[PDB]
């Protein structure tokens, strides 16, 4: 009953940000020290909680959301931020209680000649609500004329590849991101520190 944070952080494969993965963590002992003492993480930002105090707290559920974005977009995984990722791909609530953790994954997620398998949503009729997920591939109407599912003038495919090459600048290198959300409801608190 050790919380399976390994399965999330050390997953072989990570989701595209538009198709971000969520794992519900419950009914286990969480050793948060494995995370906050790690030298592996380039970002470790907590909101409404102190990372070192986490081993002292109990929650009903922990949600672990994970995906890949480029380095220069990690700043968008924060309450109240704007940009293509926060607006159209993965949106934190203004009142977020949790931690945003990221690390450079250039060694796994970049390939010589480019890895283009990680996508982001470039076009959308409106901003995502917090923790909304949109995996639709409907043709996006950018102009006054309906597309009727046909790409053309002002009628676009809504997703686009990141082009991750190991020689990219750090800003265009792939980062793996895990967002931990800490939920306290009127129920037994099933995820506690040691």
């Amino acid at each position, epitope marked *: 009953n050790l919380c399976p944070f390994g399965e999330v952080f050390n997953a072989t494969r990570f989701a595209s940000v538009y198709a971000w993965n969520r794992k519900r963590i419950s009914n286990c002992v969480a050793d948060y020290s494995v995370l906050y003492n790690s030298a592996s993480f380039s970002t470790f930002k907590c909101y409404g909680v102190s990372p070192t105090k986490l081993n002292d707290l109990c929650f009903t559920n922990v949600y672990a959301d994970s995906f890949v974005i480029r380095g220069d977009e990690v700043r968008q995984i924060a309450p109240g931020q704007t940009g293509k990722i926060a607006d159209y791909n993965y949106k934190l609530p203004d009142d977020f209680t949790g931690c945003v953790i990221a690390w450079n994954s250039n060694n796994l997620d970049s390939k010589v000649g480019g890895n*283009y398998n990680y*996508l982001y949503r*470039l076009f959308r009729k409106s901003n995502l609500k917090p923790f909304e997920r949109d995996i639709s*591939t409907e043709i996006y109407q950018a102009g006054s004329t309906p597309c009727n599912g046909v790409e053309g003038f002002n009628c*676009y*495919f*809504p*997703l*686009q*590849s990141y082009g991750f090459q190991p020689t990219n600048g750090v800003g265009y290198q792939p980062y793996r991101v895990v967002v931990l959300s800490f939920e306290l409801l009127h129920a037994p608190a099933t995820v506690c520190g040691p």
Partner: nanobody
Amino acid sequence: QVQLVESGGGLMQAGGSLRLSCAVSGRTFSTAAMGWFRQAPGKEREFVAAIRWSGGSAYYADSVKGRFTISRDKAKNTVYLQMNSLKYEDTAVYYCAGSKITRSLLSDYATWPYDYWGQGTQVTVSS
């Protein structure tokens, strides 16, 4: 691993039709695209047509609009070029190509790189 195998082409009289087929093994092109290119002697390899694999929207070089049609059969994992109203200057080696890259604007497939190529098929248009 990934093979693009062309069939069809060869000799046809001007105003006639040919149909090129390109059978893909070892990959599907999902949200990216397949295309056709051609190379005449002394000339750079030039874009002919692209198709979004998932949704099937097509993009054409101006030089073949109203004459050539690109299409694909997902079940057969095959892309086609229907070449109608053949012109003498359509004579070239035709290549099918596959892109690894998902681009939002289909017109990007006229200029962005393709990582997978067929063997090349001679098309000759005669009087």
